Paper text:
pmcThe human macrophage migration inhibitory factor ([name]) superfamily, comprised of [name] and [name] ([name], also called [name]-2), is broadly and constitutively expressed with involvement in proinflammatory and host antimicrobial responses. [name] and [name]-2 are highly similar in structure, with monomeric units of 114 and 117 amino acids, respectively, that form homotrimers. An evolutionarily conserved proline at the N terminus acts as the catalytic base for a tautomerization reaction of unknown biological significance in both proteins. The same site in [name]-2 is Phe100 and is also evolutionarily conserved among all [name]-2 proteins, suggesting this site plays an important role in both proteins.
In agreement with [name] enzyme kinetics, the activity was decreased in the S62A and [name] variants by 13% and 60% (versus wt-[name]-2), respectively. The substantial change in [name] enzymatic activity despite ∼9 Å between the mutation and catalytic sites implies long-range communication within the [name]-2 structure. Surprisingly, the [name] variant has a higher RMSD (1.245 Å) with wt-[name]-2, displaying substantial conformational changes in the β-strand housing the [name] mutation, the C-terminal region, and the loop 63 to 69 connecting the third β-strand to the second α-helix. These changes were not observed in the Y99A [name] mutant, but in [name]-2, this mutation induces the adjacent Pro101 from each subunit to form a “lid” over the solvent cavity to separate external and internal water molecules. In addition, the expansion in the [name] variant is also only 0.9 Å due to the loss of the large side chain near the mouth of the cavity and movement of Pro101 into this space, a conformational change not observed in Tyr99 [name] variants. There is an even slightly smaller network of water molecules trapped between Pro101 and Arg42 in [name] [name]-2, which has a kcat/Km ∼40% of wt-[name]-2. It must be noted that changes in the [name] water network are partly due to the truncation of the solvent cavity from multiple conformational changes. The P1G and [name] variants show similar levels of dynamic perturbation; however, the effects of [name] are strongest at the C terminus, most notably residues Ile107 and Ile110, which have been purported to be involved in [name] activation. Before our X-ray structure of [name] [name]-2 showed significant conformational changes, it was unclear why a Phe100 mutation would have a larger effect on the activity in [name]-2.
Author numbering:
A (entry chain A), B (entry chain A), C (entry chain A): 1 to 109
The structure:
């Protein structure tokens, strides 16, 4: 799976190594080997979340599989909220997680 | 819905509060409560649009619903072109709007 | 089609004009007119790819068509790996290409 985190927090307020710790958390939360987890963090953006420009973050989670995922995605989301509220010092109401489809992916040889 | 705007305009040429005014415009254009509208602006990127590196912007609009949306999406697109050409001082030919699917989204509690 | 390249390479290590040369390469590789090719490059991000924070890049390729694309997407991916390894001085194992769906897109008038 692929995690993409956009935030309007300034770069200096996003913890160093967030991408490493979020990768490890995702591996544990999603029950996937770390070598199948991808994380991208984009800070310093201009953002409105739920109509408000207060500090916030958007997390996209992309993957090929769709069938039967709704319930597990709710469970996973709750743990990512726990993780991100602590790391980013953001209230859970200022974090939104969305699930997006992929057709395929390939690592280079 | 979720709006994501990438542009190769330098940060200092993207208006302050664009994300707030685009959020309000989206609420009005899409006929959705502002608390369901999300906007992310990513400036200063390196971009080619329709084969050209002149100043440009890409707007992605993501949402769960797909059925019956083609005609309304054309109407909405025209108003977002109006809004963005004024705000960014870009010709409408240098703005591209694309519509992408989501499976679900959740706000934290 | 729409190419979006995220990388944790610093901005000064991403070649100037990468978006122009990647646009031309995509036109040739995909067999599409350059005026239908779009490229966005986002550098300086914090990233983990396949569980590792070593230098890396993610390329997303989005398009409306899905039917019958798996084999051609494998061919195209291999050429984009060739192109990006040279431009970015990254091993092919540090580049991941993913294919995502679009419902529609519109250029402004």
């Amino acid at each position: 799976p692929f995690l993409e985190l956009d935030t309007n927090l300034p770069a200096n307020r996003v913890p160093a190594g967030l991408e490493k710790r979020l990768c490890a958390a995702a591996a544990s939360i999603l029950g996937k080997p770390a070598d199948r987890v991808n994380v991208t963090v984009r800070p310093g953006l201009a953002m409105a979340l739920s109509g408000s420009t207060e500090p916030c973050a958007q997390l996209s989670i992309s993957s090929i599989g769709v069938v039967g995922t709704a319930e597990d995605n709710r469970s996973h989301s709750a743990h990512f909220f726990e993780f991100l509220t602590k790391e980013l010092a953001l209230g859970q109401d200022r974090i939104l997680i969305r699930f997006a489809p992929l057709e395929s992916w390939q690592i280079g040889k």
